[PDB]
Each structure stands twice: as C-alpha cells, then as structure tokens.
Amino acid sequence: DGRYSLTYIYTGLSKHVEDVPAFQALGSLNDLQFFRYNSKDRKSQPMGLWRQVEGMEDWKQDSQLQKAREDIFMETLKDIVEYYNDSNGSHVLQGRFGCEIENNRSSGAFWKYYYDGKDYIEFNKEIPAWVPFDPAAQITKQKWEAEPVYVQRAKAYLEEECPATLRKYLKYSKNILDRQDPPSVVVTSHQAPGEKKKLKCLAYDFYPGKIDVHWTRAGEVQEPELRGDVLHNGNGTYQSWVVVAVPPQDTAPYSCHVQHSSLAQPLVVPWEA
Ligand SMILES: *[C@@H]1O[C@H](CO)[C@@H](O[C@@H]2O[C@H](CO)[C@@H](O[C@@H]3O[C@H](CO[C@H]4O[C@H](CO)[C@@H](O)[C@H](O)[C@@H]4O[C@@H]4O[C@H](CO)[C@@H](O)[C@H](O)[C@H]4NC(C)=O)[C@@H](O)[C@H](O[C@H]4O[C@H](CO)[C@@H](O)[C@H](O)[C@@H]4O[C@@H]4O[C@H](CO)[C@@H](O)[C@H](O)[C@H]4NC(C)=O)[C@@H]3O)[C@H](O)[C@H]2NC(C)=O)[C@H](O)[C@H]1NC(C)=O
Ligand SMILES: *[C@@H]1O[C@H](CO)[C@@H](O)[C@H](O)[C@H]1NC(C)=O
Numbered sequence: 001d002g003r004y005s006l007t008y009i010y011t012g013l014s015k016h017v018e019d020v021p022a023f024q025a026l027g028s029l030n031d032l033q034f035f036r037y038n039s040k041d042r043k044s045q046p047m048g049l050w051r052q053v054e055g056m057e058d059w060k061q062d063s064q065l066q067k068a069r070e071d072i073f074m075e076t077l078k079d080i081v082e083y084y085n086d087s088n089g090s091h092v093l094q095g096r097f098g099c100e101i102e103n104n105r106s107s108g109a110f111w112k113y114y115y116d117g118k119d120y121i122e123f124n125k126e127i128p129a130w131v132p133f134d135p136a137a138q139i140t141k142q143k144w145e146a147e148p149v150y151v152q153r154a155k156a157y158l159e160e161e162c163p164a165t166l167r168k169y170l171k172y173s174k175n176i177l178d179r180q181d182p183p184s185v186v187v188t189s190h191q192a193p194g195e196k197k198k199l200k201c202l203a204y205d206f207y208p209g210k211i212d213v214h215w216t217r218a219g220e221v222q223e224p225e226l227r228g229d230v231l232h233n234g235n236g237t238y239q240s241w242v243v244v245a246v247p248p249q250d251t252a253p254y255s256c257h258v259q260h261s262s263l264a265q266p267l268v269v270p271w272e273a
C-alpha cells in the first residue's frame, strides 16, 4: 500500500501553572491526531475521527500505560534539571518517537528527546544504543544502558511493537487516512483606499493536505503576496488560501487554480470583477 506512520509526542514541564498540565502526550497516524492524554485528567482519550472508532484501543488500559510513562518521563526531566542545578526553574523535556511502514514493510522509526528545545539524546536502533548531544545526556545515556537488556528492548519496541500497533490501528483507520475529499473553492476580495486590490482564493474541506492553489493573471501564474493553510484535526480537513495584490489599472482577468489528488481535473474559479 502506501506510507503510514505512528507518532507520539511527550512534553513535560519542571514548573507549570495550575491550568497547564505538567505532562502531555499525543499520538498521530499520518497527519491526524488520534488521541491525547495529560497529567491532570490522567486519561487517554481518542480524538478527531477516532472519537467514534471503537475496539481500536482499550483507552482504560492505555491510560495506565501513559501514567507509567509519565512517571518515568517526568523523573528524567527531574534528573536533568538537577544536573544543571536549576531544580526550581522552568524547563522542558520533549520526547518524540514512532515508526512508519511503506508497502506493509517497516520503513523507519525514531526516538529522540529535546531538553529546552535543544537536542538531548537520541536512540540509534542500528547500533543499538543512545546518542548523547547534551553533556547531561551522557549521564542519562549511562543509566539507560545500565543492563545489556535495555538497548535490546528499545530496538524491539521500534522494530517490533510500534509497527505491530501501527498494523492494528490501520485495520481500524485506513479509511480515515485514505479519504479523498475534494476541496470547495471560494474567491474573495478586499480593497482599501490607496492600496492595491487584494484577491483571496480559499480551498477547503479537503483531504489529504497536499494541494496546489495559485492565481493566474490572463493565464500567467502569479506569485502570491500571502499564503496560508490549516488543518482542523477534530475534523480531518484542511484549508489553504492565497492572496494576490492586483495593480490599480490592471484589467487582465484573474482566475484561481486548484489542483488536488481527489480531483481528476484542476478546478478553476475566475474572479468576476
Ligand atoms: C471542519 O471544521 C471546520 C472548522 O472547524 C469547518 O469550517 C467551516 O467550513 C465551512 C464550509 O464547510 C465554511 O462555510 C462558509 O461557507 C460559505 C459558503 O456557504 C455555502 O455553503 C453553506 C453550507 O456549506 C450554505 O449554508 C450556504 O448557503 C452557501 O451555499 C452556497 O450558496 C451559493 C449562493 O450564493 C451557491 O451559489 C453555492 O452553490 C452554494 N454552495 C453550497 C456548497 O451550498 C463560504 O463562502 C464561506 O467562506 C468564508 O471565507 C471567506 C474568506 O475568508 C469569507 O469572506 C467568508 O465570510 C467566510 O468566512 C467565515 O466567516 C466566519 C464568520 O465571520 C468566520 O468565523 C470563519 O472563520 C470564516 N471561515 C473561513 C474559512 O474563513 C465559508 O466557507 C466556514 O466558514 C468554516 N468555518 C471555519 C471557522 O473554518 C468545516 O465546515 C468542517 N468541515 C467538515 C466536513 O466537517
Ligand atoms: C552544579 O553545581 C556544582 C556545585 O556548585 C558544580 O560543581 C557543578 O559543576 C554544577 N553542575 C553542572 C552540571 O554545571
């Protein structure tokens, strides 16, 4: 088949305000987020299109898995902070890990951490072993490879467990991930006195995100003055817009051109001056 990826992002704060949960976890399949979890509610909740999907995962049991990871992740953050002697400062530890398959064949995986935005430590499953980037990561590298077993386990997760889990979610998610929802396009305009007229083209409610939206002046592609696009996760749809500035006297016709995988033919919307 095609490419599919399973991704997780853990974020921990040494010091956080009351609303703000100290630990936050989120998972994604391709471009969409299918679940979340935070240190406050301590609950693994499905998201977007998966909110209606049942049997894919035991959210109760996963909530326990996260609670575990949390304790561990946060403790690591604790140690690091201790190293730099700033136990009472605001710091962040971010973990990102996952795998991906292409043609039903494992095609990669990763596991990396970021302390305060900087690269901290990263796992190389081909060695297998961790790679330090930050001085403290050396201590952490130490601990994490204390027993020969550890590195083996890590390699296993990425090469075995992760992909396995990806496989199962696919059984419940392929559809969501495979959608070919065409974009609706709308042309709009703005005009302030003493300024060039601005034409805006908006493509929306489409999926996948890959799309081509551009303006043409009498048939010649026009470089946009402003671009912009968004993903609405709970929804599963994208929105991409482009704005051109049309000179005062210009009479050349302006049309918006939208190309997308779900469309057999490019969609063209002219601007009726
Ligand atoms: C996923 O989740 C998304 C976000 O959570 C959500 O976003 C919202 O998407 C809808 C479209 O799906 C969008 O709606 C507006 O629709 C305008 C056209 O209306 C059509 O269609 C509606 C129903 O779809 C009908 O009720 C109308 O009658 C009308 O029908 C058309 O009627 C004409 C007659 O003249 C016929 O010729 C047509 O054939 C007929 N078509 C159809 C299909 O029936 C559209 O023009 C709106 O454009 C917006 O963007 C322009 C440029 O930015 C603005 O100038 C314009 O004012 C609109 O701005 C919105 O204004 C709001 C209030 O100020 C803002 O809060 C919004 O942020 C702003 N939206 C945008 C995109 O800028 C517009 O498309 C909503 O606007 C959009 N809202 C947001 C916040 O994104 C999706 O719907 C969800 N999709 C799914 C599948 O679940
Ligand atoms: C932390 O403070 C101690 C004692 O002042 C100092 O020796 C050490 O270098 C500091 N640790 C780091 C990682 O800078």
Ligand SMILES: *[C@@H]1O[C@H](CO)[C@@H](O)[C@H](O)[C@H]1NC(C)=O
Pocket (backbone or CB within 6 Å): 104
């Ligand atoms: C994906 O690969 C696994 C292992 O080779 C296999 O069990 C499964 O049937 C494959 N899926 C498809 C759709 O072929």
